[PDB]
Design a protein around this nucleic acid. Structure first.
Lengths: 278, 278
DNA sequence: TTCGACCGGTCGA
DNA sequence: TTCGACCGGTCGA
C-alpha cells in the first residue's frame, strides 16, 4: 500500500506498506480509531489490542511498520484532550507489554510458562521474587516470566519466576537503562530477554521514512548491536521489525538477535522460552 | 512576578516567578526571542547564552525556573520550521553543557581547572585520555574536566583529564544512563559529577506547575536520591533548582547533593572542584 | 494519591 | 556524512 502523509507547513511525504491493502488499512483504522479516545479504556489496552488485531489481519506485514506508520500516526492524529505525542509515549510502551502478554500467553500456557505485564509496583514484587532486589532498581523489569513447578519464590499455584522481558518499542540510548539490571539477572541464571519492535524511521525533509531500526548490520556491528552480540548484555533479543538484520550463525558472546512476525502460534520466541525452561 | 500561560485548549494557568520582575522578564525575552530562529546560530548556543544572560539579570531567581518557565516556554512558543518540543530536546540538553562551560571556565581557570563540552567524536578521545575507553560506552560523558599539571594524558599545555560531568536538565529514569560509566570513572580516582537543573513541574489539571524537581526529601529518600546518597553512583550531584533539597550533613555513601544559584564567581561547585582536584 | 517510566523528532561532526 | 543522544507531558496503582 501507499500511505500518504501530511506533516504540515506544506510538507507531504509517502511510504510503502508492504503486504497491506487499502482495505486492510481501513479495517484496522475502523477498529483502532474508536478506541483511541474511548472512556474508561486505557490507551495501552487500546493500542495493544489494535496491534494484536492489525498483525492478524496483515500477518505478512512488517509488525513494526504497522506500529510505527499505522497505529502511531493514526493515534497522533486522533488523540483528544491531551498532548498526542506525549500521550503516545506514556501509552504505547506499556501497550507493547500488553500485546506481548496477550499474544504469547495462550501458546505458552500448555508448557506451564506464563507472562505477566508489570505495572508500577508489580515491578518491585517481581524483582523481590527474583532475588535481585538489593542490586536492581525498583522498576527495572517490564514483563515477568514464570514457570509451573519451577523458578524461584513460587506463588500459591506453584508459579515461580524464571526471568523477565525488557520491552522497548525503540532503543535510542534508552536501552542502556536495562543493561545493568539485565546483567545482574543473567548473573542469577535468570532469563533476561530484550523484546523490541525496533522502531526508527527518519521523517522528511531529510529522511525517507523507511523504518529500518537502530541495530544496523551484523558484519559492521554498532555499539547497540554489540550490546547483544559482543557484550551479551541480554540472554537474547527478539525484534519484530522485518528490516532488522538477525545475528549471524555465531557471535562472540553467543547471544543472538532474532527476527520474526508478531502474529501466529509458535515462533522462535516461544521455542526459545520452551527450550530454556525445559 | 506572575506568569500567565496558555496551553492551547482554552486552558489558562499561572505560575509564580520569584525574584523576577516584569521588566527583567522582558529583558530576557528581548534577548532570547531573536536567537530562537536566528540563521547560522545553533539553538544550543542560543539557549545556553540566554541562560547565562538570564541568570546574571536575575541572580536571585531560581535558575531552574528560568530554564523551565522562561527559556523553555518561550522557545516552544517561538520555534519555527521544526517541531518545537522535539527541537527543544535536541538543543536544550547540549545548551546546559554550553552554559556550564561558559559560566564556570573563567572562574575555574584561576585554579588551573578547565571544562570542555564534548560533542560527537570529542567524547571518544576524552574517554581514551581518561583510560577507561575500553570499559565504558563510546559516548558516556558530556563535559570533561581537566587540570593543569595534573590528570591523565596531559596535552601540549600540560592539561590532563581529572574527571567528567554527566549533564542532565532533568532526571526521570534517564539518570540511570550514566551510572555504569560513572562508577568505573570513580574507581579510577576520576571525578564523576552529575550536574542537573532538576527540572520537573506537573502541568494542569492535576499539577500546580511549581517546579519542585525529582529528588524529593532527605527524610524519605527515593531511588533517585539514593543513587547518590546510598549507592554513591556519582562523586557529587549539583542541582541548580533552588527547591531541590540538599543532602543532610552526612550520607551513607558519603556523596552529597548540593544546591546553588547558577550565576556568580565562586560557589559550592567551584569550591568542590578545587578541594577534590588540587 | 504521588511520583515513577514510557518514547521519537531533532540536528549535528 | 550517519546515526548517535538529547528531554517532558502523560497517566496510572
Amino acid at each position: 500500500m501507499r500511505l500518504d502523509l501530511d506533516f504540515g507547513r506544506g510538507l507531504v511525504a509517502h511510504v510503502m506498506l508492504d503486504n497491506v491493502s487499502e482495505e486492510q488499512y481501513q479495517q484496522i483504522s475502523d477498529y483502532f480509531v474508536p478506541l483511541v479516545n474511548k472512556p474508561k479504556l486505557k490507551s495501552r489496552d487500546a493500542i495493544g489490542q489494535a496491534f494484536v488485531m492489525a498483525t492478524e489481519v496483515c500477518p505478512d506485514a512488517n509488525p513494526s511498520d504497522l506500529w510505527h506508520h499505522v497505529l502511531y500516526r493514526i493515534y497522533i492524529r486522533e488523540k483528544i484532550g491531551t498532548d498526542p505525542s506525549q500521550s503516545w509515549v506514556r501509552t504505547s510502551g506499556e501497550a507493547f507489554e500488553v500485546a506481548l502478554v496477550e499474544r504469547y500467553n495462550p501458546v505458552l500456557a500448555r508448557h506451564g510458562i506464563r507472562l505477566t505485564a508489570l505495572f508500577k509496583g508489580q515491578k518491585g514484587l517481581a524483582l523481590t521474587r527474583m532475588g535481585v532486589a538489593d542490586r536492581v532498581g525498583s522498576r527495572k523489569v517490564d514483563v515477568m516470566i514464570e514457570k509451573q513447578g519451577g523458578g524461584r519464590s513460587p506463588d500459591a499455584e506453584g508459579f515461580g519466576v524464571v526471568g523477565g522481558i525488557h520491552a522497548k518499542v525503540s532503543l535510542a540510548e534508552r536501552v542502556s537503562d536495562d543493561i545493568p539490571a539485565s546483567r545482574i539477572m543473567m548473573g542469577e541464571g535468570l532469563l533476561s530477554v530484550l523484546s523490541t519492535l525496533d522502531v526508527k524511521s527518519f521523517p522528511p525533509p531529510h529522511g525517507d521514512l523507511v523504518n529500518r531500526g537502530e541495530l544496523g548490520t551484523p558484519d559492521r556491528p554498532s555499539d547497540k548491536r554489540n550490546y547483544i552480540e559482543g557484550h551479551g548484555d541480554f540472554s537474547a533479543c527478539f525484534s519484530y521489525n522485518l528490516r532488522t538484520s538477525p545475528s549471524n550463525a555465531t557471535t562472540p558472546s553467543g547471544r543472538h538477535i532474532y527476527v520474526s512476525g508478531f502474529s501466529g502460534q509458535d515462533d522462535e520466541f516461544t521455542d526459545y522460552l520452551v527450550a530454556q525452561l525445559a
